[PDB]
Design a protein around this ligand. Structure first.
Ligand code: PCD
Ligand code: FES
Ligand code: FES
Ligand code: CA
Ligand code: CL
Ligand code: CL
Ligand code: CL
Ligand code: CL
Ligand code: CL
Ligand code: CL
Ligand code: CL
Ligand code: CL
Ligand code: LI
Ligand code: MG
Ligand code: MG
Ligand code: MG
Ligand code: MG
Ligand code: MG
Length: 907
């Protein structure tokens, strides 16, 4: 051990440390500076950036031996605090740079390091800096972060007053549609929002820290578990196995389709009989610290009989394949799509037909914050779980029978969280921590490291797809055929539903009167499927939007014009036979056309012998809602102090549940003149907030936004005074009148898609968009650079433009990853950010352009649709279409790795 006297955030610190200790651990654990965020722990993400003697370093890979006596360290806490914000922090808030906020302290500290060395950076200087220092963001697409740095720099340089970094209430007084900052932004930019790992450090000494004993093979029969050595190791309390589980030890898929061949009870909480995928949790070590738990978990011996594993859908789907879940076929679900007339005769007589085989793979969510959760037994005797769940009510019912609790004896709460992008539509750690809390009676905390986040949370499910179009010479689509095989890994939750998305979205965007198709779901031993932003559309629409360009090519038609010819117009129906609710695609295409033409001209002019530029188009469509008559509930409450609390379970991945609540309520409450700062939101809690439903399917703004709107309208009525005006809280209480008022809303016009035909009206609101990608391909290496992305977006009406711009930029960036670099195919190689192709700032162009072409929705609150998943529906199709434009190469199977492109170029 050594004494080091240094200065941290301007304060002399008398430090006692191990010279080998990591600075991240010292700062977080010994000094309580939890504003230093730790994600990857491998120097790849920049979340733990601190300034050490004028240099920006990653604390997670900086040992204390590298910190000299007299050193100066600055963390986010030293940059600024609430009510004492640094210009960088103010700028972050104003520009909406904090979505989940997990990367915000690291970017801001890093940016201070930049500005301290280069006071007047160009935008490229800022990008170069964040690339060098590995500052990674999965939410924002980087552009808002650069905007914030530039604005802060201008203030620090005296070019504009610092007061310009403070939001100014718009001239029309409308918060709805504005850039009003989100309520949680100040906490995020000051490092004072506690995420699950932060909370773990601030839990009492009585807390047990868990480590998972995980399968190191993909498929096995389990014969036994020996915990003897582990029990003798430092700090170990106990080891938990399936024997300690008080319920069914199975998670239920809950809404398993009737024609699913499996009962939906296939997923264990702690594996008992079998390993179904690499990483499966077989036991939990409980110890005094994460480090001690992990060390002991390594010593738990599992006796396995390894079985042949099926590591892809086609492998598991073979007729003679062995059943992974004995008694259920590996292909456990099929969904037909049967619209209009038989397609065979139509293809036979059509002027033109095209077909393609496409593949979209096992995209990893890669939030900067790895999964984390904790649980404890309350004094009320209930089991409380706090996690990254984005569907707290959903998860309560998925896990209660398995852990052995009645629904009222378990409470799920959503912690502030550093992104999920859908992986948290699935239970991950909730049942594990519940079982451990129940078994020990003690608080328990479980933090995954980044390899566990990659290997042992769910993934986008790969689809193998074949799609065909028949059309007239003039480009009019006549018919479509489709086939898709969904590799869902071993756990069935929502796999059938995902497969149905193929019937809804393959070919979406166009009038196609005749469709015959079939989707199939297959269990495999690769990672289980969890929702990933777009949930079936990125697969479906990659196939159909690439196929549209192939059809255009075969017709000798421009691919934007082919889309214009076919795009939804009044009288048309979508693939499930439903009339679209608005018709904005022709408008969007017309507005994009001259930009597309100019982009083509630029690509021709600026191409060189080795660097070929191209421009690609695609359409995206997705529903806002869960299928059928989805519904939500909110409570609007007038508090004693005149503030209003809007109670919902709108789960915040980081997308902006807070501002969605405040902005929607503010608009609804305008007749009573309620200032936005007087409107409070509630964090999701199954015991104390209404069942607003999960934040999946880009549904909350529509469903919960409507519920909030209704609740507020109902509160206005409750407050209305005879003769005009409004009662105060005191007046209402004196009259014994209610002050907490419920609102409900249902998408009553929706119907579930039919099990035989796939036809129905599954969503009452959809999101519509048109993408344009501009790329350069180095034809010597096959490397593609995306130089620009444009999204024409119809969101109906914006609740908040900082929120929606950010959603779109974030989605476009994930599209670039999906197109060019991302996968989770190799269990070890893809278990790091860099290994799996995470897009760092230089991979995302500074030119991310949005054009809102909003057509108010009949059923949306104030006309709004959702936004969340729109920008990931098909940006990767536009990108691949752009590579084709540039070079003549079509990549059918994502991602377009450089060697893959190069092989195609040279074929
Ligand atoms: N018009 C409009 C719309 C919308 N908005 C906004 O925006 C946001 C979103 O919304 P939406 O669309 O409704 O959604 P939500 O439901 O809330 O959420 C969810 C989503 O969200 C997204 N985004 C995001 N972001 C972030 N940052 N992070 C994350 O993680 C995430 N995730 C993702 C996903 S995946 Mo799934 O679960 O797969 O189905 S689905 C999803 C919010 O804040 C709101 O309010 C506005 O403003 N306006
Ligand atoms: S770089 Fe330190 S936590 Fe990722
Ligand atoms: S705001 Fe950057 S990772 Fe979420
Ligand atoms: Ca201890
Ligand atoms: Cl030492
Ligand atoms: Cl700028
Ligand atoms: Cl504004
Ligand atoms: Cl069914
Ligand atoms: Cl047919
Ligand atoms: Cl014709
Ligand atoms: Cl290919
Ligand atoms: Cl490569
Ligand atoms: Li919810
Ligand atoms: Mg100041
Ligand atoms: Mg027609
Ligand atoms: Mg025109
Ligand atoms: Mg490979
Ligand atoms: Mg090769």
């Amino acid at each position: 051990m050594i004494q080091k006297v240094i200065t941290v955030n301007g304060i002399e610190q008398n430090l006692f440390v191990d010279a080998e200790a990591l600075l991240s651990d010292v700062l977080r654990q010994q000094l309580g500076l939890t504003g230093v965020k730790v994600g990857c722990e491998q120097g790849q993400c920049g979340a733990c950036s601190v300034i050490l003697d004028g240099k920006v370093v990653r604390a997670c890979v900086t040992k204390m031996k590298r910190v000299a006596d007299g050193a100066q360290i600055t963390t986010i806490e030293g940059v600024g605090q609430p009510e004492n914000l640094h210009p960088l922090q103010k700028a972050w808030v104003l520009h909406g740079g904090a979505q989940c906020g997990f990367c915000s302290p690291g970017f801001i500290v890093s940016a201070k390091g930049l500005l301290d060395t280069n006071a007047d950076p160009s935008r490229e200087d800022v990008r170069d800096w964040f690339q060098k220092h590995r500052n990674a963001c999965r939410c924002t697409g980087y552009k808002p972060l650069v905007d914030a740095v530039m604005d802060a720099a201008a203030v620090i340089n005296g070019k504009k007053p610092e007061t310009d970094l403070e939001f100014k209430m718009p001239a029309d007084g409308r918060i709805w549609g504005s850039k009003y900052p989100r309520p949680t932004a100040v906490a995020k930019v000051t490092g004072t929002l506690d995420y699950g790992a932060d909370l773990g450090l601030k839990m009492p000494a009585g807390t047990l820290h868990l480590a998972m004993v995980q399968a190191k093979v993909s498929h096995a029969n389990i014969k036994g578990i020996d915990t003897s050595e582990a029990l003798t190791m430092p700090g170990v309390h106990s080891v938990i196995t399936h024997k300690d589980v008080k319920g069914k030890n199975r998670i239920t898929g809950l809404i398993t389709f009737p024609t699913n061949k499996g009962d939906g009870w296939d997923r264990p909480i702690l594996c008992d009989e079998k390993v179904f995928q690499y990483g499966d949790c077989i036991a939990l070590v409980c110890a005094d610290s994460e480090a001690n738990a992990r060390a002991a978990a390594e010593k738990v011996k599992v006796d396995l009989e390894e079985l042949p594993a099926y590591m892809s859908g086609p492998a598991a789907a073979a007729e003679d394949a062995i059943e992974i879940h004995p008694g259920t076929p590996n292909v456990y679900f099929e969904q037909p799509i049967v619209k209009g007339e038989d397609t065979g005769p139509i293809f036979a007589s059509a002027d033109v037909t095209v077909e393609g085989d496409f593949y979209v793979g096992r995209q990893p969510h890669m939030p900067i914050e790895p999964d984390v959760a904790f649980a404890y037994m309350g004094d009320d005797g209930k089991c409380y779980i706090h996690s990254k769940s984005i569907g707290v009510h959903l998860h309560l019912y998925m896990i209660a029978p398995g852990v052995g609790l009645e629904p009222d004896q378990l409470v799920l709460v959503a912690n502030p969280m550093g992104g999920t992008f859908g992986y948290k539509f699935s239970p991950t750690s909730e049942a594990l921590v519940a079982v451990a809390a129940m078994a020990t009676g003690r608080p328990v905390h479980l933090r995954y490291n980044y390899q566990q986040q990659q290997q042992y949370t769910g993934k986008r499910s790969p689809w193998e797809m074949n799609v065909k179009f028949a059309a007239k010479k003039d480009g009019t689509l006549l018919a479509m055929e489709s086939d898709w095989l969904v590799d869902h890994g071993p756990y069935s939750e929502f796999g059938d539903l995902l497969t149905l998305r193929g019937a809804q979205f393959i070919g979406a965007g166009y009038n196609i009167p005749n469709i015959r198709g079939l989707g199939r779901t297959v269990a495999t031993n690769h990672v289980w499927g969890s929702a990933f932003r777009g949930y079936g559309a990125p697969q479906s629409m990659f196939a159909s939007e690439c196929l549209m360009d192939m059809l255009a090519e075969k017709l000798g038609m421009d691919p934007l014009e082919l889309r214009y010819k076919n795009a939804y117009r009044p009288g048309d129906t979508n693939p499930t036979g439903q009339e679209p609710e608005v018709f904005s695609l022709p408008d969007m295409i017309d507005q994009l056309r001259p930009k597309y033409q100019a982009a083509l001209e630029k690509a021709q002019k600026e191409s060189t012998a080795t660097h070929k530029k191209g421009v690609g188009i695609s359409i995206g469509v997705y529903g806002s809602g869960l299928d059928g008559p989805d519904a939500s509930e909110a409570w609007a409450e007038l508090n004693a102090d005149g503030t209003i609390t809007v109670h919902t379970a709108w789960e915040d991945h980081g997308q902006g549940a807070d501002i969605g609540c405040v902005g929607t309520a503010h608009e609804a409450l305008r007749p009573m003149g309620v200032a936005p700062e007087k409107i409070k939101f509630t964090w999701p809690n199954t015991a104390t907030t209404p069942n607003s439903g999960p934040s999946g399917g880009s549904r909350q703004q529509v469903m919960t936004g409507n519920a909030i709107r209704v609740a507020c309208e109902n509160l206005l009525k409750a407050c209305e005074k005879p003769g005009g005006g409004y009662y105060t809280y005191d007046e209402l209480k004196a009259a014994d009148k209610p002050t907490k008022i419920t609102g409900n809303w249902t998408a009553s016009g929706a119907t579930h898609c039919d099990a035989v035909t796939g036809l129905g009206k599954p969503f009452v609101v959809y999101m519509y968009g048109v993408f344009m990608a501009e790329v350069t391909v180095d034809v010597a290496t096959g490397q593609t650079t995306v130089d620009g992305m444009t999204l024409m977006a119809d969101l109906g009406s914006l609740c908040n433009q900082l929120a929606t711009d950010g959603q779109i930029y974030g989605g476009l960036a994930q599209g670039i990853g999906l197109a060019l670099s991302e996968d989770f195919e190799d269990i070890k190689k893809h278990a790091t950010l860099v290994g799996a192709g995470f897009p760092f700032i230089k991979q995302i162009p500074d030119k991310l352009d949005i054009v809102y072409v909003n057509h108010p929705r009949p059923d949306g609150p104030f006309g709004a649709s959702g936004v969340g998943e729109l920008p990931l529906t098909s940006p990767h199709a536009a990108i691949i279409n752009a590579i084709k434009s540039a070079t003549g190469v079509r990549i059918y199977r994502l991602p377009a790795y450089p060697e893959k492109v190069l092989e195609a170029l040279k074929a």
